[PDB]
Amino acid sequence: MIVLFVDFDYFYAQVEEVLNPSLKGKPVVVCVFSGRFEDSGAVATANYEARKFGVKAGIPIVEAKKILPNAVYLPMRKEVYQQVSSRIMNLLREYSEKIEIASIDEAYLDISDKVRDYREAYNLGLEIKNKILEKEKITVTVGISKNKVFAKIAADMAKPNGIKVIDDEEVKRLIRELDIADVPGIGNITAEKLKKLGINKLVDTLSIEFDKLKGMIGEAKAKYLISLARDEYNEPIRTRVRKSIGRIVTMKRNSRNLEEIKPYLFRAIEESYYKLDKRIPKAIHVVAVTEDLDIVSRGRTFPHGISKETAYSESVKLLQKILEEDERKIRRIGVRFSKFI
DNA sequence: CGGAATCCTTCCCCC
DNA sequence: GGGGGAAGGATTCC
Ligand SMILES: Nc1nc2c(ncn2[C@H]2C[C@H](O)[C@@H](COP(=O)(O)OP(=O)(O)OP(=O)(O)O)O2)c(=O)[nH]1
Ligand SMILES: [Ca+2]
Ligand SMILES: [Ca+2]
């Protein structure tokens, strides 16, 4: 069992560089402008020249401009990066039929039925980086190990423009060595629950009654962690498919006025519908981010698919429900369609 | 900002 | 008691 994970590098900013090489060498910040005030928004990603000063995905655009007033600030163009990504996925399909496209910039490849050992996995590594570099001008990091989790961990160590193998004898040392927060699927909230249990390394999950662990972090995440620490995790590479599609926009002002919120909501539906392209949902959820940034949703499943006119009027009922059931002003409003026929 | 998956918890109907 | 859903939220990741 040999897994090869590819993670493109600083992907949105790099696509922006490829499309305008005069940017190379500069710090580049791809931005999501919310539109409220000048430079309201967040940073979607930054290249390494900007990242080394603390500019990174998550921080407000206004914060990045204090740090790096003279960086280049580009608005996010998802559709472009999506096409460039689709193209790259096609290159990887030629190295395995068993391919799992995990996100816009990450894929796993099952190269058992191609390569015989780590030495050859590695070479396939350079072949692939070099192909993508030649054909699309994009640098990627490659991680290789015996399962998907360690393949990813590998790339994270090796990025950017890296390649790295984590072999069976190293898996074993990491299970002891590796900080459990650095395991994929463990965010701040789970890492904290684990400290309180005394777990700071994968291996520690063996010192705990399964039922205490299960009760603290859920059964699913408990099994996941235990199987990992037992050198036994072994999920297969599977083609996955969109289960939902939606759009949330930010309003100019916060509001509780139905007539004020409706147009943003309609525009969210319009765009969601465009994005569905020949796919029909039986579920609709209306999603609202309140002023103190909590997220309240209200949904409805139909026994048939949902036409646009239906989605329009049903979404208004769901928005009225939210307003009736939650006292705060609304900041961001949108829709999500799911359960495709 | 934004997009999305997966999971957990509660509730519900009902054999 | 437990199968079988749906709803709404928690949490995660890019
Ligand atoms: N709008 C938005 N987009 C994000 C965010 N995080 C990641 N992305 C998008 C843009 C990124 O270029 C792309 C890839 O995610 P990554 O976590 O792998 O970041 P990055 O491209 O910098 O990877 P890298 O560290 O260079 O290997 O997905 C985010 O918080 N907001
Ligand atoms: Ca990336
Ligand atoms: Ca981490």
Side-chain angles (χ1 to χ4, degrees):
Chain A
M1 225 310 206
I2 303 188
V3 182
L4 182 129
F5 173 70
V6 200
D7 190 322
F8 318 155
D9 287 341
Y10 60 93
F11 190 59
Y12 293 4
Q14 198 181 162
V15 169
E16 289 300 349
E17 282 177 347
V18 158
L19 270 50
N20 180 14
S22 76
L23 291 175
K24 301 163 91 208
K26 243 153 290 192
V28 180
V29 183
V30 181
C31 293
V32 194
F33 303 93
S34 88
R36 298 203 138 186
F37 46 96
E38 220 182 46
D39 308 326
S40 56
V43 169
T45 188
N47 71 7
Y48 289 67
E49 284 71 26
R51 218 182 280 186
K52 54 187 197 195
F53 305 106
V55 170
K56 54 171 175 46
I59 84 185
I61 306 175
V62 161
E63 235 66 272
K65 290 178 150 211
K66 287 170 182 180
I67 299 175
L68 290 174
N70 310 111
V72 196
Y73 290 87
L74 290 175
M76 196 187 55
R77 303 190 294 171
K78 199 112 181 230
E79 339 70 11
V80 169
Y81 320 141
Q82 179 60 75
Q83 305 203 359
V84 170
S85 172
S86 291
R87 290 206 306 268
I88 297 177
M89 296 313 175
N90 296 346
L91 303 187
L92 305 166
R93 278 167 164 113
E94 305 165 0
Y95 296 77
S96 186
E97 298 86 357
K98 299 165 176 173
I99 175 164
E100 180 168 327
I101 305 181
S103 89
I104 195 169
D105 65 280
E106 294 172 352
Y108 303 83
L109 289 189
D110 191 355
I111 61 165
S112 299
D113 292 314
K114 296 290 175 314
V115 128
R116 283 190 291 120
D117 68 291
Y118 282 147
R119 183 220 124 225
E120 289 165 45
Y122 200 99
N123 289 337
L124 199 36
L126 312 167
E127 186 168 351
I128 276 153
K129 291 170 55 88
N130 195 68
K131 194 63 101 107
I132 297 163
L133 187 49
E134 179 223 330
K135 298 257 181 292
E136 282 291 6
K137 295 297 193 65
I138 270 159
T139 79
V140 314
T141 300
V142 165
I144 295 152
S145 190
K146 78 162 73 48
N147 56 43
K148 278 193 286 179
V149 168
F150 288 99
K152 180 160 179 63
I153 291 178
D156 283 337
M157 298 173 121
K159 69 178 60 174
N161 215 333
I163 168 164
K164 168 150 178 54
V165 159
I166 296 179
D167 43 89
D168 318 22
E169 75 214 48
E170 174 161 34
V171 169
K172 296 197 281 184
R173 89 175 231 82
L174 281 176
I175 292 172
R176 293 188 332 263
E177 239 47 67
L178 224 206
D179 174 18
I180 207 181
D182 276 319
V183 172
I186 314 297
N188 299 343
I189 281 185
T190 319
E192 262 28 72
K193 287 175 206 177
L194 297 167
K195 256 125 190 55
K196 298 208 290 295
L197 293 177
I199 319 208
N200 322 266
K201 305 290 179 177
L202 265 170
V203 50
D204 313 7
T205 62
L206 307 174
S207 86
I208 307 291
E209 290 316 287
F210 175 79
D211 265 88
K212 197 186 170 204
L213 190 72
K214 164 197 276 208
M216 195 69 180
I217 75 192
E219 182 180 42
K221 184 100 59 179
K223 296 201 203 118
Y224 170 75
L225 285 186
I226 289 159
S227 59
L228 261 171
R230 278 178 160 159
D231 206 318
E232 282 177 63
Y233 169 95
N234 209 23
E235 284 301 284
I237 277 54
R238 24 67 150 189
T239 282
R240 26 165 140 177
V241 264
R242 328 260 57 264
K243 312 288 198 49
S244 84
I245 274 184
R247 217 279 208 239
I248 290 110
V249 309
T250 289
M251 305 197 256
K252 261 164 252 171
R253 302 212 271 89
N254 292 48
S255 178
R256 303 244 340 162
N257 189 244
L258 182 49
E259 283 310 318
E260 214 173 284
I261 302 172
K262 285 163 61 159
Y264 291 100
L265 174 53
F266 292 151
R267 198 191 309 153
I269 296 180
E270 283 305 331
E271 296 176 24
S272 296
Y273 258 79
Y274 169 85
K275 274 204 259 182
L276 286 143
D277 218 275
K278 272 47 159 252
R279 237 179 322 200
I280 286 93
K282 301 199 299 295
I284 169 165
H285 295 260
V286 169
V287 182
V289 174
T290 49
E291 57 203 329
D292 64 332
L293 303 113
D294 222 273
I295 305 160
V296 48
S297 95
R298 288 300 193 275
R300 165 121 195 255
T301 307
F302 287 86
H304 45 93
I306 311 174
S307 70
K308 207 203 299 178
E309 302 74 353
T310 296
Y312 265 69
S313 73
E314 200 67 17
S315 82
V316 159
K317 288 168 208 165
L318 302 160
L319 172 53
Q320 282 168 327
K321 203 166 189 312
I322 302 176
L323 292 195
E324 168 229 317
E325 257 156 271
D326 210 274
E327 20 279 339
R328 315 163 258 189
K329 296 197 180 207
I330 298 196
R331 178 180 161 95
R332 303 176 69 236
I333 189 65
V335 291
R336 179 141 301 271
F337 299 95
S338 45
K339 311 190 188 177
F340 307 139
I341 296 166

